[PDB]
Design a protein around this ligand. Structure first.
Ligand SMILES: [Cl-]
Ligand SMILES: [Cl-]
Ligand SMILES: [Cl-]
Length: 129
């Protein structure tokens, strides 16, 4: 499923991500835009042998299990494939853990490089919400 922008904003808000760990909704929408282009099915292999999964590109070395990643910790206790679902619940639950791990949203490279410090409220402009 490829979410619309306002559609994803509404889902993220309903799931309690708006202002979670102090990160406004636009931060989360921007992160998803550049991590997955709002595509729940997105997967991308990383250089260390891990893979990033889903709308928020959650990593298989630390956070989810994909069965093929050396050093995997599965801290979200979830199969990575469950993070590719059309329902974002599992990705949100795991993202809440990631953003609580000490470095905030810096855990998302695309957020750090493309969202951090920018006018992130623009990502929710026009939405009823
Ligand atoms: Cl915002
Ligand atoms: Cl959803
Ligand atoms: Cl923080």
């Amino acid at each position: 499923k490829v979410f619309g922008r306002c559609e994803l904003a509404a889902a993220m808000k309903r799931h309690g991500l708006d202002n979670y760990r102090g990160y406004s909704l636009g931060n989360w929408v921007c992160a998803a835009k550049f991590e997955s282009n709002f595509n729940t099915q997105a997967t991308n292999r990383n250089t260390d042998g891990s893979t990033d999964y889903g709308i928020l590109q959650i990593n298989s070395r630390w956070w989810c299990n994909d069965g093929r990643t050396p050093g995997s910790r599965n801290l979200c206790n979830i199969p990575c494939s469950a993070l590719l679902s059309s329902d974002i619940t599992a990705s949100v639950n795991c993202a809440k853990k990631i953003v609580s791990d000490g470095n905030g949203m810096n855990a998302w490279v695309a957020w750090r490089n493309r969202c951090k410090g920018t006018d992130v409220q623009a990502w929710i402009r026009g939405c009823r919400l």
